[PDB]
Amino acid sequence: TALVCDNGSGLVKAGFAGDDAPRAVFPSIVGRPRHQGVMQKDSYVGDEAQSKRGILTLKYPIEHGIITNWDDMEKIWHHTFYNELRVAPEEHPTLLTEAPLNPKANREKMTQIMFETFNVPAMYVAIQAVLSLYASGRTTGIVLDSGDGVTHNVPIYEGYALPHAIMRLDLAGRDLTDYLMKILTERGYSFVTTAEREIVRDIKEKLCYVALDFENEMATAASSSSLEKSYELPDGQVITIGNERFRCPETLFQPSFIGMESAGIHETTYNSIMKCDIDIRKDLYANNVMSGGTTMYPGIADRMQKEITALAPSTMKIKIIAPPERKYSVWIGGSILASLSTFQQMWITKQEYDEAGPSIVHRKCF
Amino acid sequence: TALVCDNGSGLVKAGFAGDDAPRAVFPSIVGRPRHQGVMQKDSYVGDEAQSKRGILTLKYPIEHGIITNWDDMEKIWHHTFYNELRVAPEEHPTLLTEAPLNPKANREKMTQIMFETFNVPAMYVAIQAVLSLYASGRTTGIVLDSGDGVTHNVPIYEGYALPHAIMRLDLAGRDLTDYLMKILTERGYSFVTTAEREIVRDIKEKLCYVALDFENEMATAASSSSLEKSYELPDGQVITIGNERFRCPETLFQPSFIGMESAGIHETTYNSIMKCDIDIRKDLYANNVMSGGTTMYPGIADRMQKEITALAPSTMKIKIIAPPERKYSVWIGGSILASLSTFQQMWITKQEYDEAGPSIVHRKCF
Amino acid sequence: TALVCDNGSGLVKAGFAGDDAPRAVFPSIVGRPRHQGVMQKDSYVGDEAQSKRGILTLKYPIEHGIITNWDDMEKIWHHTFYNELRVAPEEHPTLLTEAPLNPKANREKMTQIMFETFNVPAMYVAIQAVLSLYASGRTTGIVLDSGDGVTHNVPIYEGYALPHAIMRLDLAGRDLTDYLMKILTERGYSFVTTAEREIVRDIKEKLCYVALDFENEMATAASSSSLEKSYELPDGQVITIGNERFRCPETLFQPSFIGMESAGIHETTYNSIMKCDIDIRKDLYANNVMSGGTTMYPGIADRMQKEITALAPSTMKIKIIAPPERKYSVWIGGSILASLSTFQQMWITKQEYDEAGPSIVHRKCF
Amino acid sequence: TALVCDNGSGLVKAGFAGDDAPRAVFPSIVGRPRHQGVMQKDSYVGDEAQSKRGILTLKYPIEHGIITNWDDMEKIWHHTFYNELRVAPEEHPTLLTEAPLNPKANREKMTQIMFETFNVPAMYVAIQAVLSLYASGRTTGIVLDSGDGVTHNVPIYEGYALPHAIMRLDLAGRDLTDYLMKILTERGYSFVTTAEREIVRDIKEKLCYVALDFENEMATAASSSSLEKSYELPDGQVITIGNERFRCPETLFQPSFIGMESAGIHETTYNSIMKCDIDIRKDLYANNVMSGGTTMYPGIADRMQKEITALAPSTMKIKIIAPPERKYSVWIGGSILASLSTFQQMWITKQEYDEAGPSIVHRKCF
Amino acid sequence: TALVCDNGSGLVKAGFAGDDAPRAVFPSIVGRPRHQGVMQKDSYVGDEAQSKRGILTLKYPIEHGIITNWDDMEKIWHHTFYNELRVAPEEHPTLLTEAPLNPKANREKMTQIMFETFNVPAMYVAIQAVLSLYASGRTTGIVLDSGDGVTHNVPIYEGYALPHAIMRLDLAGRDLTDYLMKILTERGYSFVTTAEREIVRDIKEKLCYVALDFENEMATAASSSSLEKSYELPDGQVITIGNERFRCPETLFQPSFIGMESAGIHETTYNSIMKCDIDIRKDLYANNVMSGGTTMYPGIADRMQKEITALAPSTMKIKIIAPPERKYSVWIGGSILASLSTFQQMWITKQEYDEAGPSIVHRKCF
Ligand SMILES: Nc1ncnc2c1ncn2[C@@H]1O[C@H](COP(=O)(O)OP(=O)(O)O)[C@@H](O)[C@H]1O
Ligand SMILES: Nc1ncnc2c1ncn2[C@@H]1O[C@H](COP(=O)(O)OP(=O)(O)O)[C@@H](O)[C@H]1O
Ligand SMILES: Nc1ncnc2c1ncn2[C@@H]1O[C@H](COP(=O)(O)OP(=O)(O)O)[C@@H](O)[C@H]1O
Ligand SMILES: Nc1ncnc2c1ncn2[C@@H]1O[C@H](COP(=O)(O)OP(=O)(O)O)[C@@H](O)[C@H]1O
Ligand SMILES: Nc1ncnc2c1ncn2[C@@H]1O[C@H](COP(=O)(O)OP(=O)(O)O)[C@@H](O)[C@H]1O
Ligand SMILES: [Mg+2]
Ligand SMILES: [Mg+2]
Ligand SMILES: [Mg+2]
Ligand SMILES: [Mg+2]
Ligand SMILES: [Mg+2]
Numbered sequence A, B, C, D, E: 001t002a003l004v005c006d007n008g009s010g011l012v013k014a015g016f017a018g019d020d021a022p023r024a025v026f027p028s029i030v031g032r033p034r035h036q037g038v039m040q041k042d043s044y045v046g047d048e049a050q051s052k053r054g055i056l057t058l059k060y061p062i063e064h065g066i067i068t069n070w071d072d073m074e075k076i077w078h079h080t081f082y083n084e085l086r087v088a089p090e091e092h093p094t095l096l097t098e099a100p101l102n103p104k105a106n107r108e109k110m111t112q113i114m115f116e117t118f119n120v121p122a123m124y125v126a127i128q129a130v131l132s133l134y135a136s137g138r139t140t141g142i143v144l145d146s147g148d149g150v151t152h153n154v155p156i157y158e159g160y161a162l163p164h165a166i167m168r169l170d171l172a173g174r175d176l177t178d179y180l181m182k183i184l185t186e187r188g189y190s191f192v193t194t195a196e197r198e199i200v201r202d203i204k205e206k207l208c209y210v211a212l213d214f215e216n217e218m219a220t221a222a223s224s225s226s227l228e229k230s231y232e233l234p235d236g237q238v239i240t241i242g243n244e245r246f247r248c249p250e251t252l253f254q255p256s257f258i259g260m261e262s263a264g265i266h267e268t269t270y271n272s273i274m275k276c277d278i279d280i281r282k283d284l285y286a287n288n289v290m291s292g293g294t295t296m297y298p299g300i301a302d303r304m305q306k307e308i309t310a311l312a313p314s315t316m317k318i319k320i321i322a323p324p325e326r327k328y329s330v331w332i333g334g335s336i337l338a339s340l341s342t343f344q345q346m347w348i349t350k351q352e353y354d355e356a357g358p359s360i361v362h363r364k365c366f
Helices: A047-051 A070-084 A102-115 A130-137 A173-187 A195-205 A214-223 A267-275 A278-285 A298-311 A326-337 A348-358 B047-052 B069-084 B104-116 B128-135 B171-186 B194-207 B216-222 B265-274 B278-285 B300-311 B326-337 B350-356 C049-051 C069-082 C104-116 C128-135 C173-187 C194-207 C214-223 C265-272 C278-285 C299-312 C326-337 C350-356 D049-051 D068-085 D106-118 D130-136 D173-187 D194-207 D213-223 D265-274 D278-285 D301-312 D327-337 D351-358 E046-050 E068-084 E104-116 E128-135 E173-187 E194-207 E214-223 E267-273 E278-285 E301-312 E326-337 E350-356
Strands: A003-007 A010-017 A026-028 A030-033 A055-060 A094-098 A121-128 A141-146 A151-157 A167-169 A229-230 A240-241 A288-291 B003-007 B011-016 B024-027 B030-033 B056-059 B094-098 B122-127 B142-145 B150-157 B167-169 B231-234 B237-241 B288-291 C003-007 C011-016 C024-027 C030-032 C056-059 C094-098 C122-127 C140-147 C149-157 C167-169 C229-232 C238-241 C289-290 D005-007 D011-016 D024-027 D030-032 D056-059 D094-098 D122-127 D143-148 D151-157 D167-169 D229-233 D237-240 D288-291 E003-007 E013-016 E025-027 E030-033 E054-060 E094-098 E123-126 E139-144 E151-157 E167-169 E229-230 E238-241 E290-292
Touching: A003 A070, A003 A326, A003 C104, A003 E003, A010 A070, A010 A326, A026 A070, A030 A070, A047 A151, A055 A195, A055 D049, A070 A102, A094 A102, A094 A130, A094 A326, A102 A348, A102 B047, A102 E173, A121 A130, A130 A141, A130 A151, A130 A288, A130 A326, A130 C030, A141 A267, A141 A278, A141 E013, A151 A267, A167 A267, A173 A195, A195 A229, A195 A240, A267 A278, A267 B030, A267 D068, A267 E173, A278 B194, A288 A298, A288 A326, A288 B231, A288 E123, A326 D351, B003 B069, B003 B326, B011 B069, B011 B326, B024 B047, B024 B069, B024 C024, B030 B047, B030 B069, B030 D351, B047 E229, B056 B194, B056 D151, B069 B104, B094 B216, B094 B326, B094 C229, B104 B122, B122 B128, B122 D151, B128 B150, B128 B288, B128 B326, B142 B265, B142 C289, B150 B265, B171 B194, B171 B237, B171 E104, B194 B231, B194 B237, B194 D173, B265 B278, B265 B300, B288 B300, B288 B326, B300 E139, B350 C030, C003 C069, C003 C326, C011 C069, C011 C326, C024 C049, C024 C069, C030 C049, C030 C069, C056 C194, C094 C104, C094 C128, C094 C265, C104 C122, C122 C128, C128 C140, C128 C149, C128 C289, C128 C326, C128 E003, C140 E139, C149 C265, C149 C278, C173 C194, C173 D106, C194 C229, C194 C238, C194 E214, C265 C278, C265 C299, C289 C299, C289 C326, C299 E054, D005 D068, D005 D327, D011 D068, D011 D327, D024 D049, D024 E167, D030 D049, D030 D068, D049 E326, D056 D194, D068 D106, D068 E290, D094 D106, D094 D130, D106 D351, D122 D130, D122 D173, D130 D143, D130 D151, D130 D288, D130 D327, D143 D265, D151 D194, D151 D265, D151 D278, D167 E123, D173 D194, D173 D237, D194 D237, D194 E278, D265 D278, D265 D301, D288 D301, D288 D327, E003 E068, E003 E326, E013 E068, E013 E326, E025 E046, E025 E068, E030 E046, E030 E068, E054 E194, E068 E104, E094 E104, E094 E128, E104 E123, E104 E350, E123 E128, E128 E139, E128 E290, E139 E278, E151 E267, E151 E278, E167 E267, E173 E238, E194 E229, E194 E238, E267 E278, E290 E301
Parallel strands: A003 A094, A094 A121, A141 A288, B003 B094, B094 B122, B142 B288, C003 C094, C094 C122, C140 C289, D005 D094, D094 D122, D143 D288, E003 E094, E094 E123, E139 E290
Antiparallel strands: A003 A010, A010 A026, A030 A055, A141 A151, A151 A167, A229 A240, B003 B011, B011 B024, B030 B056, B142 B150, B150 B167, B231 B237, C003 C011, C011 C024, C030 C056, C140 C149, C149 C167, C229 C238, D005 D011, D011 D024, D030 D056, D143 D151, D151 D167, D229 D237, E003 E013, E013 E025, E030 E054, E139 E151, E151 E167, E229 E238
16 A cells, blocks of 8 residues: 655645545654753654653744755654554655645655655655645646645646646745734733744634634624633633634735735635636636645635635636545545556656656656 | 538538438537646547637637648547447448639548548538538529638529639638637737637627628717627626627628738629629529528628629619528538439449549539 | 421521411520539520520521531421420421522431431422512512521512522621621620620610611711610610611621622612513512511611612612511411412422432422 | 830830830739838839739739720829830820720720820821731731730731631630639649739749640649649749649630630631631631730640641641740831831821811721 | 837836937836835835835736726826926827737827826827837838737838738736746745846846757756856845746747747747738748847847748748847837928827827727
């Protein structure tokens, strides 16, 4: 069987092709002690670093879909194969994922490590938005994939991708966490360390939601108190947040909140559709597929439906497809693809990599 | 039974002799994907290419009645026999059509393909304007046949053709579509791709008409707004056109709109009659037969009646015969001819083609 | 009853002896298609060829009273018996006519065809000018017979012919038609084909007349416009002719207009009278009988009266007998002769023709 | 000195009497721009219109020897006098030419323009075939003159013309150009515009020839490829023609190729001789004089010799006189005639034209 | 003196007629602050917006030759007259330019603003490709004008335009900048904001060039490193690009790189020549005039020469005219035209605009 590893900027999702859910889901972090030992490992990975984060400096080796720390990334891959999955990587072909419009050297270093450090027999790097469409059982649709580092739109029609219409936005979950950390200081809550950033991320996943109309919601939060929620910190302190619950996800639709010039995910989706041929726009309007953890906010599909309806012609039927399992859509689609008999010829074996060089990894790549 | 295939520049009309309507009417197009596949056939033909035109480059194998892409033309013939008609071509004699004054090699290659690729038992290539006269139940008349590529006038009197009076004009429906694409840019509508050319052709068939007096109609469209019509594009956008509705078909009467030096179809019809013997002109004046899709504009028979009346002597009775089924007149006449018992000796069998060579196909051909 | 067939160079006049008018009068033409058939007979005869002359080449089998195309002449005789008269020629004796001073083989071939192809029981070939005198109820007079091919003068006195005084002129209606075609080019009217020659013949029969004084009429046509007449062509075009109306028949009196050296019909008539015995000239002067279609011009009897009066002595009484039915005088006289009881011994039966050979047909023949 | 202007349907040949060649030879065309000027004259004449024909509509003011556009004909005469010859027409008597059997008003309008617009002192309109006989130094012969519009036969014997034997055929070089344009479509070459008609005329003058035996030549062209010739178009495209080289001039001998009913130039020449007196036919048989550009095909004199030999009695000596300068024979003969001292009394002066009216111009005219 | 303003999609070029270079050349941009002021104008135009682009959102009011933001376009015209040229527009006639095949309302709004907002005495809207031909001192040639928004081919022959042969391509410098921004992400360089798009445009103008053979150049860049160039960003960062230098301009010859279906500028130029009359193609082949900033790539004339030579017949002489000043050819030609004495009647004065309405501005317009 093949291994399917979805290395996101935030979470590692690994498992075996044919399964319906990842077997190993843990944070893509490496923690190192920032104090002096007096009485123990030198670095902690994943959930181990998450339980000891009080005395660690946590670092993400992947930033905006681009692997920046290759020594830390190998520790995470090593822990994925030997600790979480407990397999020998030299026996399973490995399907990896990558965001579109990434640097070419990122995929070439991933391939060199898998073939020369882990000695995988074969491997393949798929585009995350294409796997997300396999998971929904579709061949046509525009995928909005938003994870921890990257948000991207990829339109696909009858199995054909339109690379010139691909949009990429370096604004996802990690930027929303940093913005929530900033606006929490308005109530006197100070989260500074990398360990406290993990607390704010947990606050974001529990209490944040997308408002249907942002200006009406800002007036409701300023008048009454029905939007206030409480949250208990790990040390028993209780914090209460009001309009920060919907001001944080609103950055997805108004990136100027964090000083970005780009348009929101609704205009970016609409602009990607308008770059496509006029004859396929009607099918793309009816097949807006959402995937990734950053699309898991309550009310984001209704807000997305409302914003694109206002941009598109009134005759078009806008349909946002947001399954409840869309947090694992890239992995589930990769599990489906790696099990197809037609795909078994797409593997890049170790023999082909030695004779064709690193240039063989850029096939069907955009 | 015999097969009747009317291969126009725009549409394929195929069926069985004895029927009153073609069984298969689909566009004579071959589409090939112009993007990268990521998830499918290599080429699409006919209505299949029309429904996927968003991701295809559409090409017509026939241009101005002359087959230019013989590999694509065989795909269309193959799809006609096996997909649309679902017959074995080696069991039915095939009646084909052709515009007059075509290159000799065009008919010789059509015959070689039908005998050596499809292995038809017998075949015959008729002149389209002669079949159009069979459809109207006449033996005398001048036929104005205008399709997608060619407009031609063929005068016939008591079953005798006058080849020296045959006029051919490389200006038909496809040139009107290209001219409509050009004048639509005056309102800011940009149709560029081959798929968008199919949208403009659909606009032309729905909204364009022939003005009785062009200068009076240009003054009416410039003063009020009663001539404005709206049309919804496939993506919900609504376009509104005014004088473009009658400026596009006016090119048939003023070919200088597209930079051509020839005279309009009314003068060409009159010049063809004046090249005939004086004793038959009165019968030709009363039997102007229209055929083809480009004669389907509302008001073209009244305009044709008005223009030829102004050219002919005032004592002559000008009568334009334009039946509502004239879009299929060539096929209907070919169905009538292929069912005549007298015609059963006109078939060019496979045996005659082997002993007489390709020169046998140029009999009763002009 | 007997058949009377007057085979002129221009018209066939056939009927039954005892009647007062021919039952079948149609042009002596055979037309053959000069174009390609695409949708019909191989040749057309008589009025059928006249209605389809637009697509035919028309040929006269008789030229200057001499049958030149014997295959076409048999088609005309066949159509006369079976289509126009609808009789069996093997049951009726046939009276035929012939111009004087014809080749001997012309009458011998006519007799061989009537006896061996149509199997007539008996036949007789009369001289046309003698029949013309029977029609006027006379035994004395000089007959001026002018048809389509031949003009001839035959003087007869008390039932006796004077063959040495017979004049023959190869100038008749067909030469006048050709001359009218030539002088019509002076006004820009171009009649070239054999079908257009039939149009000019119709113009000649409607608008041409004989001027009493040619030089005074030429001055009147050159000064005013009262002699101009209009004529509508079969295609609606209107032509206008002035002095051509009387210049065409003037060729009969001035054969030098068409390059002939002979004298006009007035001098030829006078020369024929002066070749006769002096004692019969007074009776011939008073009995100038006109016959044939070429004597049907308005004013030809007054002009003939004026010209012969100027040549003859002033004491003689010149009387031109021109009945209104003189276009059929040869047939009417043949109908009278074939009904006489005295003539019933003059028939050349099939039995006499077999035993006496072809030489029996030259009896009372000049 | 006198001016000699030979206004043919195709070329203008002008010069001074006494010279042996025309000083000005240019096409008789008037071109007008058929596009929009954005950056120039309103009309171009002659060689100027020929060098700018790409953006012009070219029109011939003379069609079949008959001046149809009198405003354009005056531009050509104006350019002849002031630009090409650079003379004052009010100082030189002008000898003009005309085809026989032309409309009377054509010569009367030419005379009115020369006397009232150009104010020539005297003028004379000669018959083209008579001038062609002056050029060959003969007084007896039948002239076959074939130019761009008209082909005509004029027999002359000892200085006497036989007008009744004059044949005129509206089939010359321009009809051969149009027929070559038609049969070039058999190889896929499309020449449509008036500018492209000038290209086909240049092809005809370079590659066309008269076959000695047409059926043997058709078999040679269909078997091998030795008759194929190449020709480079003005834009670098190379066309190759085979049997079209001799099928185009064959129309002169088989006018049915273009749907004409008349006989070829060989039968027309023979028919003209047979209309002449029997005593002069032997001299006409030995003096067949060819003139005009349409007699410049290679092998037309040998073919003409062969065809007339087959029609004439075997004892007659058929001699076709075709000098290499016969393209200018009408002008050269007009230069000889205008220099004769005997001719100096034949001029129609301006004084005679005012007192005698337009009727004076029809003297020695047929 | 007259004002000549060449409003391109990218640059404004303004000056006075009679000068040899524009006096004011600045970017056609309007920038507005996208941050909060704490310590200043509300919008910046031209070079002022370019020096403060760090805190601005830059917008082009002209997109693909079509003015989309009319309020911003008036700010640019206002800054052109009063700041850059420092004149009173109510005293100078203004010559404006426009791309062919533009919407009719674009030119009508430009005229209404110049007459009612700036109160110019007269104005004229010329076609840019016609002015480019004035600059090269020619009357014949096909102009390839490629600026920031539009690429168009206009063939002109002897001062006559052929509007039916005009090609327009919505692919120019701005699309090349966007494509360079996309392929720079392959090396890890992220340019996203509108201010960073101006940095990429500066990279394109310094380092990009057209490869003579694209496939050989791709092999050279992949083997060695001689094609690598370095560029210093405004903040001191140094980027290095290799094959992106010639992959960006290659989009002009392979528009499929950016997902466009149209053919490259070489085939578009050849197709425009083949739509012209055959007699003018040789002159168009020798006079390919390049203009605009997008034709300023090193090696584009040699590549254009090589591509058209492969399409045209081998006998034709292909000559690409690319002067070193072709970046200002439209302005220089407009300065020449506005100084011609013949042009002084072409001005559309304020009086004519009031009585004739907005329809007067569409004269000599295509
Ligand atoms: N219920 C939730 N609501 C909002 N955000 C969530 C939720 N669950 C996860 N996320 C966010 O999703 C982001 C990453 O999810 P994932 O799709 O795994 O991205 P990646 O593929 O980059 O690892 C994290 O930043 C996390 O904060
Ligand atoms: N209702 C209509 N009005 C105007 N044009 C039409 C209409 N229907 C069809 N056409 C035109 O007729 C053309 C071809 O019709 P057809 O007679 O099938 O030609 P062909 O025989 O060349 O295929 C097409 O260009 C199409 O645009
Ligand atoms: N009304 C008429 N006026 C002048 N010519 C006439 C008239 N009617 C007939 N003809 C001429 O008479 C000629 C033949 O008449 P017809 O006496 O039948 O001669 P034929 O006996 O040779 O057939 C034709 O050429 C025709 O043109
Ligand atoms: N070498 C040649 N071969 C064949 N045809 C020629 C040649 N030269 C000229 N012609 C033809 O001669 C025709 C006219 O010649 P010309 O005698 O000047 O006639 P016109 O007197 O009517 O102007 C033109 O149609 C031209 O095509
Ligand atoms: N040296 C150069 N090399 C390549 N492109 C250039 C160069 N200089 C200018 N350009 C490009 O030319 C384009 C616009 O130039 P211009 O001719 O002024 O167009 P417009 O008339 O549309 O303003 C810009 O996109 C710019 O990038
Ligand atoms: Mg992800
Ligand atoms: Mg058709
Ligand atoms: Mg008779
Ligand atoms: Mg001539
Ligand atoms: Mg520009």
